[PDB]
Design an enzyme around this catalytic site. Structure first.
Site, short mmCIF file in Angstrom:
data_model
loop_
_atom_site.label_atom_id
_atom_site.label_comp_id
_atom_site.label_asym_id
_atom_site.label_seq_id
_atom_site.Cartn_x
_atom_site.Cartn_y
_atom_site.Cartn_z
N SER A 392 0.85 -1.18 0.00
CA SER A 392 0.00 0.00 0.00
C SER A 392 0.89 1.24 0.00
O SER A 392 1.60 1.49 0.97
CB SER A 392 -0.90 -0.02 1.24
N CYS A 560 -7.45 -0.58 7.35
CA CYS A 560 -6.31 -1.17 6.67
C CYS A 560 -5.47 -2.04 7.58
O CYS A 560 -5.27 -1.72 8.75
CB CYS A 560 -5.43 -0.05 6.08
N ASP A 605 -8.60 -2.09 2.94
CA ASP A 605 -7.31 -2.37 2.34
C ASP A 605 -6.70 -3.33 3.35
O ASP A 605 -5.81 -2.98 4.11
CB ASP A 605 -6.45 -1.11 2.20
N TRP A 607 -5.23 -7.40 4.07
CA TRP A 607 -4.62 -8.53 3.41
C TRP A 607 -4.28 -9.62 4.41
O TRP A 607 -4.41 -9.43 5.62
CB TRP A 607 -3.35 -8.07 2.67
C1 FAD Z 1 -3.44 -5.46 -1.56
C2 FAD Z 1 -2.40 -5.78 -0.69
C3 FAD Z 1 -1.78 -4.78 0.05
C4 FAD Z 1 -0.72 -5.09 0.90
N1 FAD Z 1 -0.06 -4.11 1.53
C5 FAD Z 1 1.02 -4.40 2.26
C6 FAD Z 1 1.72 -3.39 2.91
O1 FAD Z 1 1.51 -2.20 2.65
N2 FAD Z 1 2.73 -3.72 3.82
C7 FAD Z 1 3.05 -5.06 4.08
O2 FAD Z 1 3.89 -5.37 4.92
N3 FAD Z 1 2.36 -6.07 3.39
C8 FAD Z 1 1.34 -5.73 2.50
N4 FAD Z 1 0.81 -6.69 1.73
C9 FAD Z 1 1.34 -8.06 1.85
C10 FAD Z 1 2.47 -8.24 0.83
O3 FAD Z 1 1.93 -8.15 -0.48
C11 FAD Z 1 3.18 -9.59 0.99
O4 FAD Z 1 2.22 -10.65 1.02
C12 FAD Z 1 4.02 -9.63 2.27
O5 FAD Z 1 4.94 -8.53 2.30
C13 FAD Z 1 4.81 -10.94 2.33
O6 FAD Z 1 5.54 -11.10 1.11
P1 FAD Z 1 6.91 -11.93 1.03
O7 FAD Z 1 7.19 -12.20 -0.39
O8 FAD Z 1 7.94 -11.23 1.83
O9 FAD Z 1 6.56 -13.30 1.80
P2 FAD Z 1 6.13 -14.66 1.04
O10 FAD Z 1 7.35 -15.37 0.60
O11 FAD Z 1 5.08 -14.34 0.05
O12 FAD Z 1 5.46 -15.50 2.24
C14 FAD Z 1 4.15 -15.14 2.70
C15 FAD Z 1 3.54 -16.35 3.40
O13 FAD Z 1 4.35 -16.75 4.52
C16 FAD Z 1 3.49 -17.55 5.35
N5 FAD Z 1 3.75 -17.11 6.74
C17 FAD Z 1 4.09 -15.73 7.16
N6 FAD Z 1 4.31 -15.93 8.60
C18 FAD Z 1 4.07 -17.20 8.91
C19 FAD Z 1 4.15 -17.81 10.09
N7 FAD Z 1 4.62 -17.07 11.09
N8 FAD Z 1 3.88 -19.11 10.25
C20 FAD Z 1 3.51 -19.86 9.13
N9 FAD Z 1 3.43 -19.20 7.90
C21 FAD Z 1 3.71 -17.89 7.82
C22 FAD Z 1 2.07 -17.24 4.92
O14 FAD Z 1 1.56 -18.31 4.10
C23 FAD Z 1 2.24 -15.99 4.08
O15 FAD Z 1 1.20 -15.94 3.08
C24 FAD Z 1 -0.28 -6.41 0.99
C25 FAD Z 1 -0.91 -7.41 0.27
C26 FAD Z 1 -1.97 -7.10 -0.58
C27 FAD Z 1 -2.57 -8.11 -1.32
#
Ligand code: FAD
Ligand code: FMN
Ligand code: 2AM
Length: 608
Positions: A392, A560, A605, A607
């Site tokens: 966001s 949010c 907003d 997620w």
């Molecule tokens: C519309 C929208 C807006 C968003 N805005 C933001 C934002 O502004 N700021 C922000 O920080 N994120 C936001 N996100 C989330 C962001 O897009 C990512 O999903 C997030 O940052 C994680 O991405 P990553 O690739 O680092 O982790 P990934 O490699 O994608 O891993 C994510 C997955 O790790 C697993 N996981 C996380 N913790 C644990 C746990 N402790 N135990 C077991 N499983 C776990 C879950 O399955 C999670 O889905 C938003 C998401 C959407 C869809």
């Protein structure tokens, strides 16, 4: 709108297909399900193809009956707020406006949704209902996949009953097959090898607008600082330079980024498989007619593919493990992998606990089932695509037109698999050092927006990283006041654990409050006392004034952050406020709040 391909029915005739599966996908889940169903057809004396509805004119559905025993299946995910995925918007608009007669058409729909959302599986439900209204006949019940439980299992269950139903209706009846062929490239010009770009070759090196999902802009990271004081977590603020990109955005929009997987993970996958990751190659569709010439940009090296094009961190889905079973030389391991695709029993139990709950990624599985030694090229053909991650935007374009700010929490946790899992995008962003660190990105317009009139009161509720879009909102509301405009009340309900540990943007918020840009700065410190103090507790505290703003002032509500518990708890508190001051019964208060949502006065907003 993109230029449509010629009739998909005519294409089916020319290729001998009788089943077509369309996918409404935002993050690729429905896309993979559609491909799985398309491939299944072969095992039942039929032939299918998967297709992106955006590339076709669905009106040609009326010609589908021209093919004997034909069937169309829609794997549709929902997005936004009960809306179609971006690639299915065109199809959605057609469904609503058309009056075409679909007599003779046979269809089935599998919807992808999440029960924690306001409108569960809205898109799947709509398509299923609409096709029937237009005269088509449902061949199998609508599937309602729920990502809040286990979507993969819902698909498995539906799929297992779907095929027999199809076989029974059409009177049809029930080894590993590869979709692509490996072509190694010796002495190939480096200028023709993809190195991580998404669309056109060299698009990352030769940047040409407009920039979007297929042509992201590489933005320089000009700032990246830790926002919290403790060491338990890593909360960060990043600033991306979009100067000269011609990209436009508004507070409330989202910025998408294409990350790179951890180089150590990639290296280990190559090492355990005994494969040379630096081999340059291409995987070419054995179906020369298909528009999908490759599983990802080719030619390229396995290292590049595993780093920028493939998902190597999420738990593998059952079909992937099923196809890999043939490469496990230890019988018990081959059997375990084979049974992961089971719809019941210990095989399903093992998938759910050993793979999903334990969060075992592909490398973990290769390590824990050491007899599993698949060839690298086939593995690359099986792994899903690496998706962009959304954030966001934490800045206002009225104040920072050439910069897009991001507020995120780094993902890193101990998995039951025994290893430490790292978030792909956040680990990658965290390592970006200013002074030239580039982030491939693009902007996606949202419907999350400040009121059109500056005088309209705003109620913002976003604890933790949920404060992200509101930093932009406040920057803008402050700017408006500085521009001499009449700005209504601007209230922020924020929350964190402790004031001296994780109070994000404390300095900036104090400033806005002192200057009057923030009418109220209500902060809930959840761990400064024995009992939890959350944003909804402050909302209840201020119920009288909030009702006045909502009921008399036409205030806009914004929520949010965490969509698991916080969003619903906040919504429930608003139901209580409305019920008490309406006054009205709970049922009516709920309807009242839902009406605010439909009128654009209660925006979300949220997620995860
Ligand atoms: C519309 C929208 C807006 C968003 N805005 C933001 C934002 O502004 N700021 C922000 O920080 N994120 C936001 N996100 C989330 C962001 O897009 C990512 O999903 C997030 O940052 C994680 O991405 P990553 O690739 O680092 O982790 P990934 O490699 O994608 O891993 C994510 C997955 O790790 C697993 N996981 C996380 N913790 C644990 C746990 N402790 N135990 C077991 N499983 C776990 C879950 O399955 C999670 O889905 C938003 C998401 C959407 C869809
Ligand atoms: C921003 C966002 C909004 C969503 N909105 C809805 C929704 O309104 N209704 C629903 O049932 N599911 C909703 N979902 C959940 C998705 O439909 C579900 O995760 C689906 O599996 C995604 O499929 P895809 O990867 O093929 O797009 C949403 C997910 C995100 C990320
Ligand atoms: N269900 C909920 N509703 C509102 N805030 C919540 C919440 N669950 C946790 N929080 C709080 O949101 C902030 C960001 O995570 C933290 O202060 C967290 O408090 P806690 O972690 O002490 O429970």
């Amino acid at each position: 709108p993109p230029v449509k391909e010629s009739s998909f029915v005519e294409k089916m005739k020319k290729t001998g297909r009788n089943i077509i599966v369309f996918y409404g996908s935002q993050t690729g889940t429905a896309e993979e399900f559609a491909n799985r169903l398309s491939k299944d057809a072969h095992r039942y004396g039929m032939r299918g193809m998967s297709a992106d509805p955006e590339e076709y004119d669905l009106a040609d559905l009326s010609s589908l009956p021209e093919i004997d025993k034909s069937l169309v299946v829609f794997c549709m995910a929902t997005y936004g707020e009960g809306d179609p995925t971006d690639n299915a918007q065109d199809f959605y608009d057609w469904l609503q406006e058309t009056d075409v007669d679909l007599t003779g058409v046979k269809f089935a729909v599998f919807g992808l949704g999440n029960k924690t959302y306001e409108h569960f599986n809205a898109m799947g439900k709509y398509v299923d209902q609409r096709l029937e209204q237009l005269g088509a006949q449902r061949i199998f019940e609508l599937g309602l996949g729920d990502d809040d439980g286990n979507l993969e299992e819902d698909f498995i269950t539906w799929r297992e009953q779907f095929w027999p139903a199809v076989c029974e209706f059409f009177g049809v009846e029930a080894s590993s097959i590869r979709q692509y062929e490996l072509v190694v490239h010796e002495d190939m010009d480096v200028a023709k090898v993809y190195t991580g770009e998404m669309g056109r070759l060299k698009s990352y090196e030769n940047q040409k607008p407009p920039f979007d999902a297929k042509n992201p802009f590489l933005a320089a990271v000009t700032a990246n600082r830790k926002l919290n004081q403790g060491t338990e977590r890593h909360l960060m603020h990043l600033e991306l330079d979009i100067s000269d990109s011609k990209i436009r955005y508004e507070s409330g929009d989202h910025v998408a980024v294409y990350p790179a997987n951890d180089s150590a993970l990639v290296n280990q996958i190559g090492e355990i498989l005994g494969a040379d990751l630096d081999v340059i190659m291409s995987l070419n569709n054995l179906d020369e007619e298909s528009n999908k010439k490759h599983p990802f940009p080719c030619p390229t090296t396995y290292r590049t593919a595993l780093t920028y094009y493939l998902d190597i961190t999420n738990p593998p889905r059952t079909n992937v493990l099923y196809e890999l079973a043939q490469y496990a030389s230890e019988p018990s391991e081959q059997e375990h992998l084979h049974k992961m695709a089971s719809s019941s029993g210990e095989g399903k139990e093992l998938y759910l606990s050993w793979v999903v709950e334990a969060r075992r990624h592909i490398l973990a599985i290769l390590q824990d089932y050491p007899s599993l030694r698949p060839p690298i090229d086939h593995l690359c053909e099986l792994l899903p695509r690496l998706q962009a991650r959304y954030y966001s935007i934490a800045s206002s374009s009225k104040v920072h037109p050439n910069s897009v700010h991001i507020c995120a929490v780094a993902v890193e946790y101990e998995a039951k698999s025994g290893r430490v899992n790292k978030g792909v995008a956040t680990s990658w962003l965290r390592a970006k050092e200013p002074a030239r660190a580039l982030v491939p990105m693009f902007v996606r317009k949202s419907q999350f927006r400040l009121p059109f009139k500056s005088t309209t009161p705003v109620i913002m509720v976003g604890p933790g990283t949920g404060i992200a879009p509101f930093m932009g909102f406040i920057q803008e509301r402050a700017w408006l006041r500085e521009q001499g405009k009449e700005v209504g009340e601007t209230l922020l309900y924020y929350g964190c654990r402790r004031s001296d540990e994780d109070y994000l943007y404390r300095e900036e918020l104090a400033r806005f409050h002192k200057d009057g840009a923030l009418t109220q700065l209500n902060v809930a410190f959840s761990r400064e006392q024995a009992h939890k103090v959350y944003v909804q507790h402050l909302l209840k505290r201020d119920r009288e004034h909030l009702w006045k703003l909502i009921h008399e002032g036409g205030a806009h509500i914004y929520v949010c952050g965490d969509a698991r518990n916080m969003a619903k708890d906040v919504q429930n508190t608003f139901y209580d406020i409305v019920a008490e001051f309406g006054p009205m019964e709970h049922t009516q208060a709920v309807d009242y709040v839902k009406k605010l949502m439909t009128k654009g006065r209660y925006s979300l907003d949220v997620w995860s």
